[PDB]
Amino acid sequence: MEFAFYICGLIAILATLRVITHTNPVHALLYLIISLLAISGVFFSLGAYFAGALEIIVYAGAIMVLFVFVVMMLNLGGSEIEQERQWLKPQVWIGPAILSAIMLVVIVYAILGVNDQGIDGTPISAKAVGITLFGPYVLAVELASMLLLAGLVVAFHVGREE
Amino acid sequence: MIPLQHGLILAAILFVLGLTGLVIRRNLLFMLIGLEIMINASALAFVVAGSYWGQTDGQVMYILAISLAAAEASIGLALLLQLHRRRQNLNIDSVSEMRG
Amino acid sequence: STEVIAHHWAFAIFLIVAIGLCCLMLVGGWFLGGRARARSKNVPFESGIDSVGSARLRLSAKFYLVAMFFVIFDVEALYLFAWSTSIRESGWVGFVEAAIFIFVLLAGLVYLVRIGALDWTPARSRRER
Amino acid sequence: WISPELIEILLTILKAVVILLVVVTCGAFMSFGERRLLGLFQNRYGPNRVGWGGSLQLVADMIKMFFKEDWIPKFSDRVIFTLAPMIAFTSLLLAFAIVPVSPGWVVADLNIGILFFLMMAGLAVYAVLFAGWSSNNKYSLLGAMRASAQTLSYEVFLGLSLMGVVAQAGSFNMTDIVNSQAHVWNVIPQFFGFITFAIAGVAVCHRHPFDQPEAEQELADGYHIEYSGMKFGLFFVGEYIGIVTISALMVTLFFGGWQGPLLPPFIWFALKTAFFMMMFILIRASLPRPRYDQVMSFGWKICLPLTLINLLVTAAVILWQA
Amino acid sequence: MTITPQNLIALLPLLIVGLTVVVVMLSIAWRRNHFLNATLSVIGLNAALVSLWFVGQAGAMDVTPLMRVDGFAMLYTGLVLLASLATCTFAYPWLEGYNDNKDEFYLLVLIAALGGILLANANHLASLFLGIELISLPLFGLVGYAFRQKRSLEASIKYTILSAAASSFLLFGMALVYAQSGDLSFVALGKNLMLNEPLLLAGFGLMIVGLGFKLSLVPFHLWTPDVYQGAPAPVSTFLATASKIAIFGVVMRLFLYAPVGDSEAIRVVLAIIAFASIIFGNLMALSQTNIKRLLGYSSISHLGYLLVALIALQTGEMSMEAVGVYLAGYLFSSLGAFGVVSLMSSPYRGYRGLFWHRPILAAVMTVMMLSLAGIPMTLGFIGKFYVLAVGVQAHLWWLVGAVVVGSAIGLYYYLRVAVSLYLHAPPSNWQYSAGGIVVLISALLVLVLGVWPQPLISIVRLAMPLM
Amino acid sequence: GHPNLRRIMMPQTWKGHPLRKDYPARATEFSPFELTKAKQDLEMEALTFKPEEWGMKRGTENEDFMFLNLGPNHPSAHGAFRIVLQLDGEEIVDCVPDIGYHHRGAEKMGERQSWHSYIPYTDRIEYLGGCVNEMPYVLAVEKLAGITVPDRVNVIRVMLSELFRINSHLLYISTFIQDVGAMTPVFFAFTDRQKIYDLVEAITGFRMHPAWFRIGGVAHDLPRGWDRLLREFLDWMPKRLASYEKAALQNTILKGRSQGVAAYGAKEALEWGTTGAGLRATGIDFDVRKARPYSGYENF
Numbered sequence A: 001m002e003f004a005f006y007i008c009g010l011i012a013i014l015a016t017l018r019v020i021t022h023t024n025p026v027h028a029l030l031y032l033i034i035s036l037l038a039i040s041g042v043f044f045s046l047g048a049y050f051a052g053a054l055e056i057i058v059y060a061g062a063i064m065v066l067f068v069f070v071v072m073m074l075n076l077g078g079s080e081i082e083q084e085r086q087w088l089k090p091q092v093w094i095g096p097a098i099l100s101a102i103m104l105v106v107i108v109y110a111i112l113g114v115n116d117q118g119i120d121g122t123p124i125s126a127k128a129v130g131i132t133l134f135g136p137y138v139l140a141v142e143l144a145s146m147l148l149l150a151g152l153v154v155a156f157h158v159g160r161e162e
Numbered sequence B: 001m002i003p004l005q006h007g008l009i010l011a012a013i014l015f016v017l018g019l020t021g022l023v024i025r026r027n028l029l030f031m032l033i034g035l036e037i038m039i040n041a042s043a044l045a046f047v048v049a050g051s052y053w054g055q056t057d058g059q060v061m062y063i064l065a066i067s068l069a070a071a072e073a074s075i076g077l078a079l080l081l082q083l084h085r086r087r088q089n090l091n092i093d094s095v096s097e098m099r100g
Numbered sequence C: 001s002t003e004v005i006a007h008h009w010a011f012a013i014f015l016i017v018a019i020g021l022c023c024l025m026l027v028g029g030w031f032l033g034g035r036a037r038a039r040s041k042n043v044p045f046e047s048g049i050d051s052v053g054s055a056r057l058r059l060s061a062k063f064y065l066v067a068m069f070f071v072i073f074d075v076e077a078l079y080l081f082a083w084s085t086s087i088r089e090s091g092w093v094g095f096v097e098a099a100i101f102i103f104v105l106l107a108g109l110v111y112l113v114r115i116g117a118l119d120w121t122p123a124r125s126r127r128e129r
Numbered sequence D: 001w002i003s004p005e006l007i008e009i010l011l012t013i014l015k016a017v018v019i020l021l022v023v024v025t026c027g028a029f030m031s032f033g034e035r036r037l038l039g040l041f042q043n044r045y046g047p048n049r050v051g052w053g054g055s056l057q058l059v060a061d062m063i064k065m066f067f068k069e070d071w072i073p074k075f076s077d078r079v080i081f082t083l084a085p086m087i088a089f090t091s092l093l094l095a096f097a098i099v100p101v102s103p104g105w106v107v108a109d110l111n112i113g114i115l116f117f118l119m120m121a122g123l124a125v126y127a128v129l130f131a132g133w134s135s136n137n138k139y140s141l142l143g144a145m146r147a148s149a150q151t152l153s154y155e156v157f158l159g160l161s162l163m164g165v166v167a168q169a170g171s172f173n174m175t176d177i178v179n180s181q182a183h184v185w186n187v188i189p190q191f192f193g194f195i196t197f198a199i200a201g202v203a204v205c206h207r208h209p210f211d212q213p214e215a216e217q218e219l220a221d222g223y224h225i226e227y228s229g230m231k232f233g234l235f236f237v238g239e240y241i242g243i244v245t246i247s248a249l250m251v252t253l254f255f256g257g258w259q260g261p262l263l264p265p266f267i268w269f270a271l272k273t274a275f276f277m278m279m280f281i282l283i284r285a286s287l288p289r290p291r292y293d294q295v296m297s298f299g300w301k302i303c304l305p306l307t308l309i310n311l312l313v314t315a316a317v318i319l320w321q322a
Numbered sequence E: 001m002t003i004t005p006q007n008l009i010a011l012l013p014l015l016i017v018g019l020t021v022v023v024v025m026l027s028i029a030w031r032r033n034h035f036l037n038a039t040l041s042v043i044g045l046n047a048a049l050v051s052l053w054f055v056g057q058a059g060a061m062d063v064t065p066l067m068r069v070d071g072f073a074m075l076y077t078g079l080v081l082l083a084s085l086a087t088c089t090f091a092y093p094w095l096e097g098y099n100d101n102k103d104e105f106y107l108l109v110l111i112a113a114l115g116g117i118l119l120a121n122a123n124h125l126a127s128l129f130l131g132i133e134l135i136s137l138p139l140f141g142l143v144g145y146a147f148r149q150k151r152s153l154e155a156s157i158k159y160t161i162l163s164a165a166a167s168s169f170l171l172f173g174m175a176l177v178y179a180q181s182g183d184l185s186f187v188a189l190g191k192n193l194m195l196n197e198p199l200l201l202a203g204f205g206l207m208i209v210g211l212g213f214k215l216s217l218v219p220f221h222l223w224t225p226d227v228y229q230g231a232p233a234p235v236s237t238f239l240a241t242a243s244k245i246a247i248f249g250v251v252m253r254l255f256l257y258a259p260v261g262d263s264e265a266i267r268v269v270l271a272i273i274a275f276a277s278i279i280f281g282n283l284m285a286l287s288q289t290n291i292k293r294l295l296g297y298s299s300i301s302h303l304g305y306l307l308v309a310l311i312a313l314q315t316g317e318m319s320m321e322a323v324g325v326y327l328a329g330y331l332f333s334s335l336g337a338f339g340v341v342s343l344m345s346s347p348y349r350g351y352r353g354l355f356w357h358r359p360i361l362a363a364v365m366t367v368m369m370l371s372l373a374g375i376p377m378t379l380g381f382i383g384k385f386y387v388l389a390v391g392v393q394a395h396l397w398w399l400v401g402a403v404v405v406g407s408a409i410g411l412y413y414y415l416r417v418a419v420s421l422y423l424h425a426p427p428s429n430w431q432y433s434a435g436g437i438v439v440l441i442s443a444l445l446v447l448v449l450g451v452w453p454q455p456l457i458s459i460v461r462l463a464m465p466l467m
Numbered sequence F: 001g002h003p004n005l006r007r008i009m010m011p012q013t014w015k016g017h018p019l020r021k022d023y024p025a026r027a028t029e030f031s032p033f034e035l036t037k038a039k040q041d042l043e044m045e046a047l048t049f050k051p052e053e054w055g056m057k058r059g060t061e062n063e064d065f066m067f068l069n070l071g072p073n074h075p076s077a078h079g080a081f082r083i084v085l086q087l088d089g090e091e092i093v094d095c096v097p098d099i100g101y102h103h104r105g106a107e108k109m110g111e112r113q114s115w116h117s118y119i120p121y122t123d124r125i126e127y128l129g130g131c132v133n134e135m136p137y138v139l140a141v142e143k144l145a146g147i148t149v150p151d152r153v154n155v156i157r158v159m160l161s162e163l164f165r166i167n168s169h170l171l172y173i174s175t176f177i178q179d180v181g182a183m184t185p186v187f188f189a190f191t192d193r194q195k196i197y198d199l200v201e202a203i204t205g206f207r208m209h210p211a212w213f214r215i216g217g218v219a220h221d222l223p224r225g226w227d228r229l230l231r232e233f234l235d236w237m238p239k240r241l242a243s244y245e246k247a248a249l250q251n252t253i254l255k256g257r258s259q260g261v262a263a264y265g266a267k268e269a270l271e272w273g274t275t276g277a278g279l280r281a282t283g284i285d286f287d288v289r290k291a292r293p294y295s296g297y298e299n300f
């Protein structure tokens, strides 16, 4: 169980790093799919089967429309990759790299300072998540439905051609 | 049996990688991709937090996190389509006429 | 127990043998059979005449509005996935919450249908008259 | 290695391997049976010369495909071009890896089940998308866009069609689902769920009338025109494995799976799966192909509210009798 | 625990706003009529405002694991409902000139009001996060409502990207806090504790980053002049009033109900953020020629003053009423100023010497400019006096010195705008008249409650939550 | 004053005008067709669509137009021709139907053959028509000669032309159903075509290009027993046609793909010279077999 979690975590880290430092949009989307598959594998190793199930179910459709928009605008041959290459320079990425590194080491210092007892890996079924979702957490569900409705209304209002 | 610290460190690494892709990348689509990476990393940290305590609260917070992720992705995708329609490029540094 | 590790091993062997079989038939297809040489072999197929431009042009999909609605409706679907597995223990009150949820869902769907969204077909292709 | 637990593990591994080889062989023989059944539907015979009854036609097809040259175009992205047939072959195989064919004969007894099938469908669309984009052809790009529009059409209600079955069974496991149909099959209470899942499952495999990405009349064979050799065969074999997977899943979800009065359970499962396979061929031979905008409008305006109302009515009926 | 009918009695504004959201949706889908949906939104908001009386007659109750309703939630719900009503009233004459559809504006305003009410009633981390996102997303829609205009699209893109980043930061800090404590309730943060542990402190710091973005706090304040200028003027009114009121109310609920507020390090970093916010927001508006960016820096400075009033909550028991009085005065002054700006920007097509053609709007604008400076005979002075008293009581001398310096700088630029209203420069419809009446009552309320502030003190002190 | 006067039957790199009297008719007059690399490249550049010549304006600020060759090698194209589509997404902005790929020089061949020996070339003008293609030529030659054919000749020619009309209509209906998407009725329609072909093989001795009409009559008399096969076909046909109707022509998916699609009125039918089923589908009752009756169609 440790092996699957650690291999999926390493794959997720590598695929995210390849995502943020790539010029090809379709290859970046493929590595993003790989990273989210690895994230769902991490979820499955921790016993949260529903979390990994929703990570593959709803993000396969999310990156699908990302592919649709990439085909819609970004694909132009080598010109788009060449234009994306000029925006990335050694100073340009070395600027915020040390900021991300110092933030990461501060958060790691924070993480290591807490007590630990180990994750037992006991599976949590979708039945318990459904009971808690429609039980103690009513208003989260209802106002999340209203939030998604609001986002849908915003998408309709902005995304019209004419 | 699996340490909580390693899962939180993994989530932190993914979060700072998403922020690196948010800052250093100039095309708006990669900023939205990096935003998706941070929201997935925060959701992942919530699932590790819920799995350490053996509660469904982390999974419910993950559900809310990805509902927000989907809604913000649709809104940002519509805004990016508007930007590409009325500018014909996805340079985010040209959005600077409002200053001072 | 023993059944669980047996099932895990069976699933892992299923994955490994499936991927290896796909790779093996790909390798066998690539290695067997002589190659062909032609002047226009490495040209995209466009019914026998050279292309105008290339196939890497940007193509305006008309269903992008439906796509960014599809993500939202997929998230509503995941909420109903979570509800539907625990209907009996949720009780009638949980049925009331899900009824309100689904009523908001159809209200948004009727709103999308009526305002002209989910309708991207051209005027010449609307089958009028 | 002399222990009951290790030989039980070996027996389970052997059963999973047997299931995998049988379903792959059944996909290839299902291609041959599609040719024969289209002949039967259209007042003809089909291949009945290669061996007795044409039984060696599939072997000659395999030999030709293996010795047809496999090429990668210079204008294509090679990695994605090779990757797409692998996904098309393997995604619905992994979807089939949860189908219980008999009591004691299942590869994975997952607690997610139909969730895993939804994951594999959402991963299977990317094979057609990658094949359409990577080949760098105009017909392929049009086919990939049509496939994306088709996924927009079907994936909204693909899971909500089966949420009635999940609600009736009270669990996500296929074993619990086929055990919940001990008294009556699920086609009778979940009939709107049945027809909506039939529409969505035919749309999953891109089978007729939902063959928008590869419509020969429209896009001149569509997205996989640059594919040839064993990659083209991988696409077709993965499509046929998808047909078998969707048929078996529909049998387990709406027709009890292996439950039957007199015959052995595998005999009933195979009979119902072959019935739905010949129904796939009957649907392909019978009705024409609609326009994909009409398909999207039908999947959004009709099928999705139907699944929502079906889930609401199913919940009301379940809580009324509880 | 289940839901009792008394819980839905206490849930009246949330249910009313959701019901009128659905009703406005169905009326828009039936027929695109601007006046009908506008009247429906105003009717629903007024229905919630008068259902606040029945909520008060019900009592204070912990309605959910998520929500808690008391006088605190009642007061902030009333403030955000008044802000939403004024936003609709200012938006209708602006929307009369919109060539595109004018019906989604009120739907987004109603959904954002629902998010503000849920933020006011929040007693859970999940409720806090959902309320923040439910404030932000309709603001993404409303800021980029006139996307044909370049600046509105600029502000929409900037606000969306920055607020998604801040939501990710806040959610990661939330996850770290939940990993530390194990309960997401507002009363169980650190109950197992030795109150200083690095994981809980880092989680609260990341939530501080997110909320300080949402409260225009330094150094997460750079979006405020840009988003305020780019957005439409009723959207600027709503973002200045309702979002700030709701987010600061839930911030005070979190920092009062949790035992983590007793920690010295969070108080020290909040004092640093408050000092930097006051000085930076006042100094940045010195040479501002545009009224929207000037009001954005004004919002930064006033949220810094609110931060000073919030820091001393653990020591003195009069900090909460100080924040309530300051937020009421700030709401009225911002409503008046942004309403004058909106009425000058209406109808939508696409302030020097304003007294010589529009004298009443100039009077309202100079009254609100006097009020925002903390000058007596106005409500902003009463709020500044409360903030200074709270800072003096808990001995925060750097903060009150910063308040005095920032008040002097604000005096300079506010009074510059006030005299520029009266220098020499080189409608006809009852909705515009209604907006003029709204800003006139705002100015009159500011003047009357500056002269006689005691009834507002009584109403604010009667809005007393569970100590 | 013509907008775009360019070659429509010959390629753009063609010298001379072929229907002039001094132009050689036969391929043996010119050098035999030598396909070299340079000639292949030159003719491929000639066949490449140039949108600037047609004023197609190959771009928009938002997105780029898609130029697609529908044909010559397309299942939807009914021959060797190509429609060049300017597209945005899936929508057609403009079309350039490029023809001339199926040019056999049949008029120049008419100047090259005798009156009797041109009849097989008339048969291949519309290869699903056969005797329907034969009739106008032999009738015009009989007008030239001054020949009035008797009643039996007229009835036999009406028989063969109506048989081939049923054949062509069966192929057209099956082809339409196939392009809508249903691939089954084409097999049965071609079985009915084989029944008609059995009768036509019995009478004329050939399947699809009979070349059986002559100047002043037909090649042979009717063989003994043709009425048996005609009765067999007349018994076999209507049940099959009703089956085709109730199976595919009453299909709501087929109706959705068909009704309202590519619709025009009588004005568009008249200004573009549209004849046949389209002109009558616009409501204009103009059929040659009734308006200007030929070959004794008045007796039917």
Ligand SMILES: CCCCCCCCCCCCCCCCCC(=O)OC[C@H](COP(=O)(O)OCCN)OC(=O)CCCCCCCCCCCCCCCCC
Residues within 6 Å of the ligand: C126, C127, D195, D198, D199, D201, D202, D209, D246, D247, D250, D276, D279, D280, D283, D290, D291, D294, D295, D296, D297, D298, F252, F253, F255, F256, F257
């Ligand atoms: C194991 C899995 C496999 C199981 C095999 C057996 C089941 C297979 C199911 C196949 C389903 C195919 C569904 C095809 C739907 C096509 C809908 C469509 O696009 O119709 C368009 C057409 C015209 O569009 P319209 O909206 O009228 O025009 C608007 C333009 N202004 O509008 C119309 O034509 C209107 C009528 C639409 C009818 C939709 C289909 C009805 C249900 C499917 C057919 C019956 C399947 C079997 C059911 C059980 C039978 C015992």
Ligand SMILES: CCCCCCCCCCC1=C(C)C(=O)C(OC)=C(OC)C1=O
Residues within 6 Å of the ligand: F074, F075, F076, F077, F078, F079, F080, F175, F178, F186
């Ligand atoms: C293989 C299953 C039976 C196919 C039967 C096809 C019958 C003819 C189809 C129409 C058609 C004709 C006449 C035709 O001439 C043609 O051009 C060469 C086509 O494109 C390939 C056609 O599709």
Ligand SMILES: CCCCCCCCCCCCCCCCCCCC
Residues within 6 Å of the ligand: A095, A096, A098, A099, B093
């Ligand atoms: C054309 C405009 C481009 C703007 C690019 C902005 C890049 C910012 C990079 C910041 C890197 C900071 C590294 C750490 C500095 C020291 C710590 C913070 C300040 C005390």
Ligand SMILES: CCCCCCCCCCCCCCCCCCCC
Residues within 6 Å of the ligand: D018, D019, D022, D023, D026, D101, D102, D105, D264, D265, D266, D267, D269, D270, D271, D273, D274
């Ligand atoms: C057309 C039928 C397709 C079936 C696909 C799935 C078959 C999987 C292989 C099953 C092999 C084992 C069968 C059951 C064995 C135990 C019972 C024996 C007596 C029936």
